[PDB]
Write a protein that binds this ligand. Structure first.
Ligand SMILES: [Mg+2]
Length: 386
């Protein structure tokens, strides 16, 4: 985990500032199984923390000025418990700015701070990613073949920018199209993208809970000849239904992993996973967060389970996920959305051959525009301390 031996006890939180950054994704995202068009506009809530005269930047949620006021003057060491873990009370609000800060101060990327590695460092961090942007962008098209063509073109847009693996939204028949037609269209689209991605491209499908078990089996059977890497959120997680699905997949010799964990998850999901009903856990990279994921990842690794942190709606989480991978053995993929946030320079990262290359620069390797953030803090955000 985190090594905090070189943190001096005199280093205190001097200032906390907050602002909302805005940008856009490269291509507008349509509906998914459960809700309507997501659009192009993106935001990231950011805090800038100052400790011992140095700044760190990162995602911050659930923080008010009044909360922050109470943290000004506290010693950085006191934010950690006896184990070198950031205390629960500070995680959502400050883990990212604090981790970035530690990286800036020590001149190390976060991945080196959290790997717990013993062997000499220096090797570049290269992490598998997948293109998560394949929404229901075809709904304005009545013709199934036209729809497949459009979705193939979207996959090819990602492919030209280095993407090799793709997560395809399915569930069109749950809400937005008639049940049977939408399910037929899901299948055709998945086939179409498979053809684009080729033999080494991993394909995932995400129903946003719009299926039931029999719809799921109908789709999986139809896609027998297609290699599917995982099935995500087929329906709200249920141990009995997944036990059934797993047995069914086994009898068929169909190798598809079951992935779940986003949103308001069952409190028993991990238990179900340890019993073999779910293979890949997808708690979000912002909530419950990075520190939580370090601990969770250790537990999942211990059970031979896989980690694939959810990230959507927050560009910052992409880069966080990349660093988290160094602390988790069975880390699957960074969930990638192509986003440009104003004031948030992520050019140190690049995508090539289905992997994100994480830079070895300090902290999270993201360079914020200090002056723009200051403007946003003052206009619409807030500041505590000095
Ligand atoms: Mg779920």
């Amino acid at each position: 985990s985190l090594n905090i031996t070189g943190i001096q006890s005199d280093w205190k939180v001097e200032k906390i500032e907050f602002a909302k950054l805005t940008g856009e994704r490269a291509r507008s995202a349509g509906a998914n199984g459960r809700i309507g068009v997501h659009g192009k506009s993106c935001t990231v809530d950011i805090a800038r923390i100052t400790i011992d005269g140095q700044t760190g930047y990162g995602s911050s949620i659930h923080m008010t000025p009044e909360w922050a006021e109470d943290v000004i003057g506290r010693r950085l060491l006191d934010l950690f418990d006896d184990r070198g873990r950031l205390r629960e009370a500070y995680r959502l609000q400050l883990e990212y700015p604090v981790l970035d800060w530690l990286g800036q101060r020590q001149g190390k990327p976060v991945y080196d701070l959290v790997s717990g590695a013993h062997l000499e460092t220096g090797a570049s961090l290269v992490v598998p990613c997948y293109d998560t942007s394949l929404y229901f962008d075809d709904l304005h098209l009545a013709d199934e073949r036209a729809a497949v063509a459009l979705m193939q073109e979207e996959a090819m847009q990602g492919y030209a920018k280095g993407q090799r693996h793709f997560k395809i939204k399915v569930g069109r028949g749950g809400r937005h199209m008639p049940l049977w037609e939408g399910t037929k269209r899901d299948i055709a689209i998945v086939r179409g993208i498979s053809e684009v991605a080729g033999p080494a491209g991993k394909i995932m499908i995400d129903a946003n809970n719009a299926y039931n078990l029999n719809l799921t089996k109908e789709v999986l059977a139809a896609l027998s000849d297609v290699n599917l890497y995982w099935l995500e959120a087929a329906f709200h997680e249920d141990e009995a239904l997944y036990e059934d699905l797993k047995e069914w997949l086994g009898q068929r010799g169909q190798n598809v992993l079951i992935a779940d964990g986003e949103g308001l998850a069952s409190p028993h999901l991990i238990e179900w996973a340890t019993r073999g009903r779910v293979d890949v856990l997808q708690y979000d990279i912002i909530w419950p967060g990075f520190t939580h994921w370090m601990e969770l990842g250790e537990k999942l690794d211990a059970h031979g389970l896989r980690s694939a942190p959810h990230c959507y709606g927050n560009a910052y989480g992409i880069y966080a996920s990349g660093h988290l991978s160094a602390a988790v053995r069975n880390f699957e993929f960074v969930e990638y959305d192509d986003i440009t946030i104003e004031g948030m320079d992520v050019s140190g990262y690049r995508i090539e051959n289905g992997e994100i290359h994480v830079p070895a620069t300090p902290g999270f390797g993201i360079v914020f525009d200090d002056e723009l953030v200051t403007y946003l803090i003052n206009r619409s955000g807030w500041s505590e301390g000095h």
